[PDB]
PDB file of all heavy atoms in Angstrom:
ATOM      1  N   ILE A   1      39.241  69.724  93.034  1.00 24.94           N
ATOM      2  CA  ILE A   1      39.836  70.113  91.758  1.00 24.94           C
ATOM      3  C   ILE A   1      41.346  69.853  91.718  1.00 24.94           C
ATOM      4  O   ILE A   1      42.057  70.099  92.692  1.00 24.94           O
ATOM      5  CB  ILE A   1      39.584  71.631  91.477  1.00 24.94           C
ATOM      6  CG1 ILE A   1      38.084  71.922  91.424  1.00 24.94           C
ATOM      7  CG2 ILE A   1      40.240  72.088  90.154  1.00 24.94           C
ATOM      8  CD1 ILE A   1      37.778  73.368  91.527  1.00 24.94           C
ATOM      9  N   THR A   2      41.809  69.412  90.549  1.00 24.18           N
ATOM     10  CA  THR A   2      43.218  69.134  90.283  1.00 24.18           C
ATOM     11  C   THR A   2      43.504  69.588  88.839  1.00 24.18           C
ATOM     12  O   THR A   2      42.591  69.628  88.008  1.00 24.18           O
ATOM     13  CB  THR A   2      43.558  67.620  90.516  1.00 24.18           C
ATOM     14  OG1 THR A   2      44.968  67.414  90.375  1.00 24.18           O
ATOM     15  CG2 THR A   2      42.807  66.705  89.552  1.00 24.18           C
ATOM     16  N   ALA A   3      44.751  69.964  88.556  1.00 23.30           N
ATOM     17  CA  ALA A   3      45.137  70.425  87.216  1.00 23.30           C
ATOM     18  C   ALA A   3      45.417  69.291  86.231  1.00 23.30           C
ATOM     19  O   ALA A   3      45.840  68.200  86.621  1.00 23.30           O
ATOM     20  CB  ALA A   3      46.347  71.348  87.297  1.00 23.30           C
ATOM     21  N   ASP A   4      45.151  69.571  84.957  1.00 24.04           N
ATOM     22  CA  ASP A   4      45.370  68.641  83.852  1.00 24.04           C
ATOM     23  C   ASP A   4      46.187  69.450  82.835  1.00 24.04           C
ATOM     24  O   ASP A   4      45.635  70.045  81.906  1.00 24.04           O
ATOM     25  CB  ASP A   4      44.015  68.188  83.269  1.00 24.04           C
ATOM     26  CG  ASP A   4      44.140  67.065  82.231  1.00 24.04           C
ATOM     27  OD1 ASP A   4      45.196  66.397  82.142  1.00 24.04           O
ATOM     28  OD2 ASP A   4      43.147  66.841  81.508  1.00 24.04           O
ATOM     29  N   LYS A   5      47.504  69.483  83.058  1.00 25.30           N
ATOM     30  CA  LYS A   5      48.465  70.219  82.227  1.00 25.30           C
ATOM     31  C   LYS A   5      48.569  69.815  80.757  1.00 25.30           C
ATOM     32  O   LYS A   5      48.855  70.657  79.900  1.00 25.30           O
ATOM     33  CB  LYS A   5      49.858  70.170  82.862  1.00 25.30           C
ATOM     34  CG  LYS A   5      50.021  71.044  84.094  1.00 25.30           C
ATOM     35  CD  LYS A   5      51.454  71.008  84.604  1.00 25.30           C
ATOM     36  CE  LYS A   5      51.683  72.020  85.723  1.00 25.30           C
ATOM     37  NZ  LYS A   5      51.601  73.436  85.245  1.00 25.30           N
ATOM     38  N   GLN A   6      48.309  68.537  80.474  1.00 26.37           N
ATOM     39  CA  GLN A   6      48.370  67.983  79.117  1.00 26.37           C
ATOM     40  C   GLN A   6      47.273  68.524  78.200  1.00 26.37           C
ATOM     41  O   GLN A   6      47.483  68.688  76.995  1.00 26.37           O
ATOM     42  CB  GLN A   6      48.290  66.454  79.167  1.00 26.37           C
ATOM     43  CG  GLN A   6      49.439  65.795  79.916  1.00 26.37           C
ATOM     44  CD  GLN A   6      49.278  64.291  80.021  1.00 26.37           C
ATOM     45  OE1 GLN A   6      48.488  63.791  80.827  1.00 26.37           O
ATOM     46  NE2 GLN A   6      50.034  63.557  79.210  1.00 26.37           N
ATOM     47  N   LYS A   7      46.113  68.810  78.793  1.00 28.02           N
ATOM     48  CA  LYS A   7      44.956  69.335  78.070  1.00 28.02           C
ATOM     49  C   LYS A   7      44.680  70.806  78.394  1.00 28.02           C
ATOM     50  O   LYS A   7      43.662  71.364  77.964  1.00 28.02           O
ATOM     51  CB  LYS A   7      43.717  68.470  78.354  1.00 28.02           C
ATOM     52  CG  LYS A   7      43.777  67.082  77.721  1.00 28.02           C
ATOM     53  CD  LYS A   7      42.551  66.249  78.051  1.00 28.02           C
ATOM     54  CE  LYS A   7      42.648  64.867  77.423  1.00 28.02           C
ATOM     55  NZ  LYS A   7      41.455  64.039  77.745  1.00 28.02           N
ATOM     56  N   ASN A   8      45.606  71.423  79.141  1.00 28.31           N
ATOM     57  CA  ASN A   8      45.552  72.835  79.570  1.00 28.31           C
ATOM     58  C   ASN A   8      44.278  73.200  80.348  1.00 28.31           C
ATOM     59  O   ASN A   8      43.800  74.336  80.304  1.00 28.31           O
ATOM     60  CB  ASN A   8      45.749  73.777  78.368  1.00 28.31           C
ATOM     61  CG  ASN A   8      46.880  74.760  78.581  1.00 28.31           C
ATOM     62  OD1 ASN A   8      46.650  75.948  78.816  1.00 28.31           O
ATOM     63  ND2 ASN A   8      48.116  74.268  78.501  1.00 28.31           N
ATOM     64  N   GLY A   9      43.756  72.220  81.078  1.00 28.73           N
ATOM     65  CA  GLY A   9      42.546  72.429  81.842  1.00 28.73           C
ATOM     66  C   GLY A   9      42.591  71.815  83.217  1.00 28.73           C
ATOM     67  O   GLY A   9      43.657  71.739  83.842  1.00 28.73           O
ATOM     68  N   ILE A  10      41.414  71.437  83.715  1.00 27.66           N
ATOM     69  CA  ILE A  10      41.287  70.828  85.038  1.00 27.66           C
ATOM     70  C   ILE A  10      40.433  69.575  85.029  1.00 27.66           C
ATOM     71  O   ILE A  10      39.785  69.247  84.032  1.00 27.66           O
ATOM     72  CB  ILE A  10      40.670  71.799  86.102  1.00 27.66           C
ATOM     73  CG1 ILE A  10      39.257  72.234  85.713  1.00 27.66           C
ATOM     74  CG2 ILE A  10      41.548  72.993  86.314  1.00 27.66           C
ATOM     75  CD1 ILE A  10      38.237  72.052  86.804  1.00 27.66           C
ATOM     76  N   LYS A  11      40.459  68.894  86.170  1.00 28.13           N
ATOM     77  CA  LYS A  11      39.680  67.694  86.439  1.00 28.13           C
ATOM     78  C   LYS A  11      39.061  67.931  87.811  1.00 28.13           C
ATOM     79  O   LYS A  11      39.682  68.559  88.678  1.00 28.13           O
ATOM     80  CB  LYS A  11      40.560  66.437  86.471  1.00 28.13           C
ATOM     81  CG  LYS A  11      40.942  65.908  85.101  1.00 28.13           C
ATOM     82  CD  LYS A  11      41.938  64.766  85.176  1.00 28.13           C
ATOM     83  CE  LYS A  11      42.187  64.206  83.786  1.00 28.13           C
ATOM     84  NZ  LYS A  11      43.305  63.229  83.746  1.00 28.13           N
ATOM     85  N   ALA A  12      37.818  67.492  87.975  1.00 25.95           N
ATOM     86  CA  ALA A  12      37.109  67.639  89.237  1.00 25.95           C
ATOM     87  C   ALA A  12      36.407  66.343  89.589  1.00 25.95           C
ATOM     88  O   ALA A  12      35.885  65.649  88.708  1.00 25.95           O
ATOM     89  CB  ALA A  12      36.119  68.803  89.183  1.00 25.95           C
ATOM     90  N   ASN A  13      36.413  66.011  90.877  1.00 25.58           N
ATOM     91  CA  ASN A  13      35.807  64.776  91.361  1.00 25.58           C
ATOM     92  C   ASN A  13      35.241  64.937  92.765  1.00 25.58           C
ATOM     93  O   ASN A  13      35.786  65.691  93.576  1.00 25.58           O
ATOM     94  CB  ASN A  13      36.860  63.644  91.338  1.00 25.58           C
ATOM     95  CG  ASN A  13      36.276  62.281  91.684  1.00 25.58           C
ATOM     96  OD1 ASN A  13      36.578  61.714  92.737  1.00 25.58           O
ATOM     97  ND2 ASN A  13      35.426  61.757  90.802  1.00 25.58           N
ATOM     98  N   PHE A  14      34.099  64.282  93.000  1.00 22.36           N
ATOM     99  CA  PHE A  14      33.423  64.258  94.295  1.00 22.36           C
ATOM    100  C   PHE A  14      32.345  63.187  94.386  1.00 22.36           C
ATOM    101  O   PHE A  14      31.816  62.739  93.367  1.00 22.36           O
ATOM    102  CB  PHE A  14      32.839  65.633  94.700  1.00 22.36           C
ATOM    103  CG  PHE A  14      31.788  66.186  93.763  1.00 22.36           C
ATOM    104  CD1 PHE A  14      30.412  65.995  94.026  1.00 22.36           C
ATOM    105  CD2 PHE A  14      32.160  66.966  92.659  1.00 22.36           C
ATOM    106  CE1 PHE A  14      29.421  66.586  93.193  1.00 22.36           C
ATOM    107  CE2 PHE A  14      31.185  67.564  91.826  1.00 22.36           C
ATOM    108  CZ  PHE A  14      29.812  67.373  92.095  1.00 22.36           C
ATOM    109  N   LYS A  15      32.005  62.827  95.623  1.00 25.46           N
ATOM    110  CA  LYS A  15      30.969  61.844  95.924  1.00 25.46           C
ATOM    111  C   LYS A  15      29.697  62.567  96.361  1.00 25.46           C
ATOM    112  O   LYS A  15      29.749  63.500  97.170  1.00 25.46           O
ATOM    113  CB  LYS A  15      31.438  60.893  97.030  1.00 25.46           C
ATOM    114  CG  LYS A  15      32.461  59.849  96.593  1.00 25.46           C
ATOM    115  CD  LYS A  15      31.808  58.731  95.780  1.00 25.46           C
ATOM    116  CE  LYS A  15      32.775  57.581  95.512  1.00 25.46           C
ATOM    117  NZ  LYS A  15      33.958  58.004  94.707  1.00 25.46           N
ATOM    118  N   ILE A  16      28.570  62.169  95.773  1.00 26.32           N
ATOM    119  CA  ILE A  16      27.253  62.743  96.071  1.00 26.32           C
ATOM    120  C   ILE A  16      26.481  61.708  96.883  1.00 26.32           C
ATOM    121  O   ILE A  16      26.581  60.506  96.617  1.00 26.32           O
ATOM    122  CB  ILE A  16      26.418  63.013  94.774  1.00 26.32           C
ATOM    123  CG1 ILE A  16      27.283  63.658  93.684  1.00 26.32           C
ATOM    124  CG2 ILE A  16      25.233  63.929  95.090  1.00 26.32           C
ATOM    125  CD1 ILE A  16      26.830  63.369  92.261  1.00 26.32           C
ATOM    126  N   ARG A  17      25.742  62.178  97.887  1.00 26.35           N
ATOM    127  CA  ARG A  17      24.914  61.319  98.733  1.00 26.35           C
ATOM    128  C   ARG A  17      23.468  61.796  98.650  1.00 26.35           C
ATOM    129  O   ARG A  17      23.074  62.746  99.331  1.00 26.35           O
ATOM    130  CB  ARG A  17      25.394  61.336 100.191  1.00 26.35           C
ATOM    131  CG  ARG A  17      26.712  60.627 100.426  1.00 26.35           C
ATOM    132  CD  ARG A  17      27.492  61.293 101.545  1.00 26.35           C
ATOM    133  NE  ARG A  17      28.940  61.197 101.337  1.00 26.35           N
ATOM    134  CZ  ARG A  17      29.665  62.015 100.571  1.00 26.35           C
ATOM    135  NH1 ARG A  17      29.097  63.018  99.907  1.00 26.35           N
ATOM    136  NH2 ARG A  17      30.979  61.850 100.502  1.00 26.35           N
ATOM    137  N   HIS A  18      22.697  61.162  97.769  1.00 23.87           N
ATOM    138  CA  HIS A  18      21.290  61.499  97.586  1.00 23.87           C
ATOM    139  C   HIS A  18      20.482  60.834  98.690  1.00 23.87           C
ATOM    140  O   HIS A  18      20.668  59.656  98.962  1.00 23.87           O
ATOM    141  CB  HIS A  18      20.794  61.018  96.221  1.00 23.87           C
ATOM    142  CG  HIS A  18      21.343  61.792  95.065  1.00 23.87           C
ATOM    143  ND1 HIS A  18      21.224  63.161  94.961  1.00 23.87           N
ATOM    144  CD2 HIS A  18      21.998  61.386  93.952  1.00 23.87           C
ATOM    145  CE1 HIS A  18      21.780  63.565  93.834  1.00 23.87           C
ATOM    146  NE2 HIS A  18      22.256  62.507  93.201  1.00 23.87           N
ATOM    147  N   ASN A  19      19.597  61.597  99.327  1.00 24.42           N
ATOM    148  CA  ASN A  19      18.773  61.077 100.412  1.00 24.42           C
ATOM    149  C   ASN A  19      17.498  60.397  99.900  1.00 24.42           C
ATOM    150  O   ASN A  19      16.719  61.003  99.167  1.00 24.42           O
ATOM    151  CB  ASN A  19      18.448  62.198 101.403  1.00 24.42           C
ATOM    152  CG  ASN A  19      19.693  62.916 101.900  1.00 24.42           C
ATOM    153  OD1 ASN A  19      20.525  62.334 102.592  1.00 24.42           O
ATOM    154  ND2 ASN A  19      19.838  64.177 101.521  1.00 24.42           N
ATOM    155  N   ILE A  20      17.346  59.112 100.229  1.00 23.59           N
ATOM    156  CA  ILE A  20      16.178  58.312  99.832  1.00 23.59           C
ATOM    157  C   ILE A  20      15.075  58.481 100.883  1.00 23.59           C
ATOM    158  O   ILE A  20      15.357  58.740 102.057  1.00 23.59           O
ATOM    159  CB  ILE A  20      16.524  56.777  99.681  1.00 23.59           C
ATOM    160  CG1 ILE A  20      17.756  56.580  98.791  1.00 23.59           C
ATOM    161  CG2 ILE A  20      15.352  56.003  99.054  1.00 23.59           C
ATOM    162  CD1 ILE A  20      18.311  55.156  98.793  1.00 23.59           C
ATOM    163  N   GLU A  21      13.830  58.299 100.441  1.00 25.30           N
ATOM    164  CA  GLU A  21      12.616  58.407 101.259  1.00 25.30           C
ATOM    165  C   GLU A  21      12.559  57.530 102.521  1.00 25.30           C
ATOM    166  O   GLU A  21      11.920  57.909 103.503  1.00 25.30           O
ATOM    167  CB  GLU A  21      11.382  58.140 100.382  1.00 25.30           C
ATOM    168  CG  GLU A  21      11.424  56.803  99.627  1.00 25.30           C
ATOM    169  CD  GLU A  21      10.240  56.582  98.700  1.00 25.30           C
ATOM    170  OE1 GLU A  21       9.730  57.560  98.107  1.00 25.30           O
ATOM    171  OE2 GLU A  21       9.833  55.411  98.546  1.00 25.30           O
ATOM    172  N   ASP A  22      13.235  56.379 102.491  1.00 28.43           N
ATOM    173  CA  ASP A  22      13.258  55.456 103.634  1.00 28.43           C
ATOM    174  C   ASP A  22      14.307  55.804 104.704  1.00 28.43           C
ATOM    175  O   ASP A  22      14.356  55.180 105.769  1.00 28.43           O
ATOM    176  CB  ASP A  22      13.405  53.988 103.162  1.00 28.43           C
ATOM    177  CG  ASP A  22      14.678  53.726 102.346  1.00 28.43           C
ATOM    178  OD1 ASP A  22      15.532  54.625 102.200  1.00 28.43           O
ATOM    179  OD2 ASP A  22      14.827  52.588 101.852  1.00 28.43           O
ATOM    180  N   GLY A  23      15.142  56.796 104.398  1.00 29.25           N
ATOM    181  CA  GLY A  23      16.181  57.230 105.320  1.00 29.25           C
ATOM    182  C   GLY A  23      17.578  56.852 104.876  1.00 29.25           C
ATOM    183  O   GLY A  23      18.559  57.331 105.448  1.00 29.25           O
ATOM    184  N   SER A  24      17.669  55.970 103.880  1.00 25.85           N
ATOM    185  CA  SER A  24      18.945  55.502 103.332  1.00 25.85           C
ATOM    186  C   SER A  24      19.499  56.509 102.320  1.00 25.85           C
ATOM    187  O   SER A  24      18.876  57.543 102.065  1.00 25.85           O
ATOM    188  CB  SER A  24      18.749  54.136 102.668  1.00 25.85           C
ATOM    189  OG  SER A  24      19.975  53.600 102.203  1.00 25.85           O
ATOM    190  N   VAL A  25      20.706  56.253 101.811  1.00 23.88           N
ATOM    191  CA  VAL A  25      21.307  57.139 100.815  1.00 23.88           C
ATOM    192  C   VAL A  25      21.692  56.430  99.514  1.00 23.88           C
ATOM    193  O   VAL A  25      21.981  55.233  99.504  1.00 23.88           O
ATOM    194  CB  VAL A  25      22.510  58.009 101.358  1.00 23.88           C
ATOM    195  CG1 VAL A  25      22.031  59.040 102.376  1.00 23.88           C
ATOM    196  CG2 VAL A  25      23.579  57.167 101.959  1.00 23.88           C
ATOM    197  N   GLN A  26      21.562  57.160  98.408  1.00 23.63           N
ATOM    198  CA  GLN A  26      21.905  56.674  97.074  1.00 23.63           C
ATOM    199  C   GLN A  26      23.211  57.374  96.698  1.00 23.63           C
ATOM    200  O   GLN A  26      23.242  58.590  96.512  1.00 23.63           O
ATOM    201  CB  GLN A  26      20.771  56.994  96.077  1.00 23.63           C
ATOM    202  CG  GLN A  26      21.084  56.832  94.567  1.00 23.63           C
ATOM    203  CD  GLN A  26      21.396  55.404  94.150  1.00 23.63           C
ATOM    204  OE1 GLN A  26      20.528  54.539  94.183  1.00 23.63           O
ATOM    205  NE2 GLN A  26      22.643  55.158  93.758  1.00 23.63           N
ATOM    206  N   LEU A  27      24.287  56.593  96.626  1.00 23.74           N
ATOM    207  CA  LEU A  27      25.605  57.113  96.290  1.00 23.74           C
ATOM    208  C   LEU A  27      25.786  57.378  94.810  1.00 23.74           C
ATOM    209  O   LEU A  27      25.195  56.705  93.963  1.00 23.74           O
ATOM    210  CB  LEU A  27      26.700  56.171  96.793  1.00 23.74           C
ATOM    211  CG  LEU A  27      27.057  56.318  98.275  1.00 23.74           C
ATOM    212  CD1 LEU A  27      27.592  55.009  98.815  1.00 23.74           C
ATOM    213  CD2 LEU A  27      28.075  57.447  98.463  1.00 23.74           C
ATOM    214  N   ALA A  28      26.577  58.405  94.515  1.00 25.54           N
ATOM    215  CA  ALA A  28      26.870  58.791  93.148  1.00 25.54           C
ATOM    216  C   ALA A  28      28.224  59.462  93.083  1.00 25.54           C
ATOM    217  O   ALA A  28      28.628  60.148  94.020  1.00 25.54           O
ATOM    218  CB  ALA A  28      25.785  59.717  92.596  1.00 25.54           C
ATOM    219  N   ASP A  29      28.936  59.222  91.987  1.00 25.17           N
ATOM    220  CA  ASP A  29      30.249  59.805  91.769  1.00 25.17           C
ATOM    221  C   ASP A  29      30.167  60.696  90.544  1.00 25.17           C
ATOM    222  O   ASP A  29      29.601  60.306  89.530  1.00 25.17           O
ATOM    223  CB  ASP A  29      31.294  58.700  91.555  1.00 25.17           C
ATOM    224  CG  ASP A  29      32.701  59.248  91.297  1.00 25.17           C
ATOM    225  OD1 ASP A  29      33.441  59.491  92.274  1.00 25.17           O
ATOM    226  OD2 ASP A  29      33.071  59.408  90.110  1.00 25.17           O
ATOM    227  N   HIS A  30      30.758  61.881  90.652  1.00 27.19           N
ATOM    228  CA  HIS A  30      30.798  62.859  89.571  1.00 27.19           C
ATOM    229  C   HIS A  30      32.279  63.032  89.203  1.00 27.19           C
ATOM    230  O   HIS A  30      33.083  63.406  90.054  1.00 27.19           O
ATOM    231  CB  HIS A  30      30.163  64.187  90.058  1.00 27.19           C
ATOM    232  CG  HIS A  30      30.189  65.311  89.056  1.00 27.19           C
ATOM    233  ND1 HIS A  30      29.076  65.693  88.340  1.00 27.19           N
ATOM    234  CD2 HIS A  30      31.175  66.172  88.699  1.00 27.19           C
ATOM    235  CE1 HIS A  30      29.375  66.738  87.588  1.00 27.19           C
ATOM    236  NE2 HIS A  30      30.641  67.049  87.787  1.00 27.19           N
ATOM    237  N   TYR A  31      32.631  62.697  87.961  1.00 28.24           N
ATOM    238  CA  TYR A  31      34.001  62.853  87.455  1.00 28.24           C
ATOM    239  C   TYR A  31      33.875  63.856  86.313  1.00 28.24           C
ATOM    240  O   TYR A  31      33.223  63.581  85.309  1.00 28.24           O
ATOM    241  CB  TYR A  31      34.593  61.522  86.962  1.00 28.24           C
ATOM    242  CG  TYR A  31      36.106  61.558  86.771  1.00 28.24           C
ATOM    243  CD1 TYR A  31      36.978  61.406  87.875  1.00 28.24           C
ATOM    244  CD2 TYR A  31      36.679  61.766  85.494  1.00 28.24           C
ATOM    245  CE1 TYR A  31      38.399  61.462  87.716  1.00 28.24           C
ATOM    246  CE2 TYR A  31      38.101  61.827  85.318  1.00 28.24           C
ATOM    247  CZ  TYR A  31      38.946  61.673  86.436  1.00 28.24           C
ATOM    248  OH  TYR A  31      40.314  61.722  86.281  1.00 28.24           O
TER     249      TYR A  31
END
C-alpha cells in the first residue's frame, strides 16, 4: 500500500502466483 494524496485515498499493488495442476504457476498482477 502507498498513499494517493491527489485523490485523498490509496493505491495497492501485488503479484499473485496461482498454482496450476501440472506444478507450474500462473502469474497475475492486482493494481
Side-chain angles (χ1 to χ4, degrees):
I1 300 165
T2 186
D4 188 16
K5 286 184 172 292
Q6 298 176 283
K7 290 179 181 180
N8 235 254
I10 61 129
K11 281 173 175 171
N13 186 248
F14 61 96
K15 285 285 188 298
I16 316 152
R17 289 148 212 83
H18 289 305
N19 307 294
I20 309 170
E21 55 183 34
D22 59 5
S24 184
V25 292
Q26 167 64 67
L27 279 153
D29 179 88
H30 178 103
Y31 195 81

